[PDB]
Design a protein around this ligand. Structure first.
Ligand SMILES: *[C@@H]1O[C@H](CO[C@@H]2O[C@@H](C)[C@@H](O)[C@@H](O)[C@@H]2O)[C@@H](O[C@@H]2O[C@H](CO)[C@@H](O[C@@H]3O[C@H](CO)[C@@H](O)[C@H](O[C@H]4O[C@H](CO)[C@@H](O)[C@H](O)[C@@H]4O)[C@@H]3O)[C@H](O)[C@H]2NC(C)=O)[C@H](O)[C@H]1NC(C)=O
Ligand SMILES: *[C@@H]1O[C@H](CO)[C@@H](O[C@@H]2O[C@H](CO)[C@@H](O)[C@H](O)[C@H]2NC(C)=O)[C@H](O)[C@H]1NC(C)=O
Ligand SMILES: *[C@@H]1O[C@H](CO)[C@@H](O)[C@H](O)[C@H]1NC(C)=O
Lengths: 229, 189
């Protein structure tokens, strides 16, 4: 299993021991090892209701798996180039003496540029996702806008699985010209802005959640109209 | 730079000593917890718990194959000693043995590669101007095996060492680097 993430973004490495029933996870070890290197380091380990993110992942790794439905999935945030390698979930279920070994390979791509240049009239995609090996993991996506220094904000678009008719399109400066290019069921929250105007020039800020955990992305959209001389 | 998985070579029917001594650090305040895992034939998809230490109570409760055959050497395991003994070693006990110590936030790990050789014993000596074959077939054993047949047969002298005397027209000593064996046969023309 492969995953590709850009530096800065987040990734959810699934770990779901699929039995024929609900079983409480007794333990998970997440180890990290660089390709072709036998050295390895603990990322996060969990036992008897105790979660211990460790090492240089101490601030970045969370256990987002449901400990009741056989799930020890990991969420890694603010990914760096030094995170490139194999990650191995070692997991054991309660009232059960079998330990499961599931690996996942992580490739890290260079950072996405913060600056985006588009011409008036253009449709422009704005990328935002959590790469994952498991579906339906994103809970909430929130796009805000603003030429934002000492200035207020607007809601571009928002979605919230938790809620019913979760889709919300600005209806402000983004009247019926903004929508999801992908689907959240695949943990993607990318949107497109259809008719770029000068008035749209500012900071768009994506905010993607798996529960309470936030991953923020910010894109600076420049807009140009060629004066004809 | 890292350190490999200690390699332990033992004979059958006896007891393997796997050292796993630890020193706690002041941070390390969580519940102490030890868990030994066996990895049969080293398959990298699954390990099994053999012995576990938790709630300051031991558990030998699993891996029915090892029922009654594995124990923490130490008396006071918390004192910083997690070593174990594996008793009455058999060929099924071959695998990879791992020592996992956890006391939040501290954690340690040791890999042990266990190998179980068998002293050669249980060799059959049997015969099949004919096209004879004399045979010294062992089981169980392990290679590289050596054979030496005796009594002073001249056209057999070359076969003295091979386990088959393909005869055409008193002993058999069997040896490896962990044990020996003696067997006797009779022939008639
Ligand atoms: C993990 O992150 C922690 C900080 O995270 C904190 O705790 C978490 C539980 C969570 O609540 C977080 O949201 C919360 O931030 C790191 O620990 C901090 O490390 C920094 C860096 O050294 C410390 O910063 C120092 O703070 C001093 C006062 O408290 C201050 O005097 C220092 O200023 C000096 O250093 C800076 C550059 O670092 C320099 O610019 C200044 O001019 C000056 O020289 C310094 O900033 C924090 O105090 C630590 N923890 C706190 C405040 O709780 C930890 O390093 C990190 N670990 C990993 C592996 O990422
Ligand atoms: C665990 O096994 C080890 C390994 O055999 C035992 O160590 C032996 O102890 C005896 C008695 O003192 C010594 O004479 C031997 O030299 C030791 N090792 C051998 C023969 O291999 C140890 O005694 C056992 N401990 C427990 C608690 O079971
Ligand atoms: C489950 O744990 C209980 C604790 O009392 C134990 O009695 C039981 O044997 C365990 N069963 C299995 C199948 O692991």
């Amino acid at each position: 299993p492969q995953l590709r993430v850009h530096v800065g973004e987040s990734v959810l490495m699934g770990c779901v021991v699929q039995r024929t029933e609900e079983k409480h996870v007794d333990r998970v070890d997440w180890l990290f090892s660089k390709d072709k290197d036998d050295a390895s380091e603990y990322v996060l380990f969990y036992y008897s209701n105790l979660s211990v993110p460790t090492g240089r992942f101490q601030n970045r790794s969370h256990l987002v798996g449901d400990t009741f439905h056989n799930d020890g999935s990991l969420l890694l945030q603010d990914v760096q180039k030094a995170d490139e390698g194999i990650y191995t979930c070692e997991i054991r279920l309660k009232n059960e003496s079998m330990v499961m070994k599931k690996p996942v390979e992580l490739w890290v791509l260079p950072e996405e540029p913060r600056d985006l240049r588009v011409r008036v009239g253009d449709t422009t995609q704005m990328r935002c996702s959590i790469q994952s090996t498991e579906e339906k993991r994103v809970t909430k996506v929130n796009w805000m806008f603003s030429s934002g220094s000492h200035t207020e904000e607007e809601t571009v678009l928002s979605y919230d699985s938790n809620m019913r008719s979760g889709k919300f399109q600005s209806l402000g400066r983004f009247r019926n010209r903004v929508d999801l290019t992908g689907d959240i069921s695949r943990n993607d929250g990318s949107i497109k802005l259809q008719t770029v105007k000068e008035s749209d020039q500012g900071i768009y800020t994506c905010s993607i959640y798996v529960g309470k955990l936030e991953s923020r992305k910010t894109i600076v959209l420049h807009v140009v109209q060629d004066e004809f001389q | 730079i890292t350190t490999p998985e200690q390699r332990i070579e033992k004979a059958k029917g006896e007891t393997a000593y796997l050292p796993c001594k630890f020193t706690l650090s002041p941070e390390d305040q969580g519940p102490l917890d030890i868990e030994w895992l066996i990895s049969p034939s080293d398959n990298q998809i699954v390990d099994q718990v053999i012995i576990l230490y938790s709630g300051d109570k031991i558990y030998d409760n699993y891996y029915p194959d090892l029922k009654g055959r594995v124990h923490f050497t130490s008396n006071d395991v918390k004192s910083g000693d997690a070593s174990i003994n594996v008793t009455n070693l058999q060929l099924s006990d071959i695998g990879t043995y791992q020592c996992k110590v956890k006391k939040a936030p501290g954690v340690a790990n040791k890999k042990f590669l266990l190998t179980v050789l068998v002293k050669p014993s249980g060799t059959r000596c049997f015969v099949d101007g004919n096209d004879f074959k004399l045979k010294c077939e062992p089981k169980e054993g392990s290679l590289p095996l050596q054979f030496e047949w005796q009594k002073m047969p001249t056209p057999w002298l070359a076969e003295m060492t091979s386990p088959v005397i393909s005869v055409k027209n008193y002993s058999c000593t069997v040896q490896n680097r962990v044990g020996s064996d003696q067997c006797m046969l009779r022939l008639d023309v």
